[PDB]
């Protein structure tokens, strides 16, 4: 399982910052985006 942690405010913001480990799904909060890996 791989996870990223990315700045972002709002769920619809969250979606550009996950892209790092290559994931997708966005969903931020307190300045943190998580990944859902596939």
């Given at each position: 399982?791989?996870?990223?942690?990315?700045?972002?405010?709002?769920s619809?913001?969250?979606?550009?910052?996950?892209?790092?480990?290559?994931?997708?799904?966005?969903k931020?909060?307190?300045?943190?985006?998580?990944?859902?890996?596939?």
């Amino acid at each position: 399982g791989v996870e990223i942690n990315v700045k972002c405010s709002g769920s619809p913001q969250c979606l550009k910052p996950c892209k790092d480990a290559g994931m997708r799904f966005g969903k931020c909060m307190n300045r943190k985006c998580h990944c859902t890996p596939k």
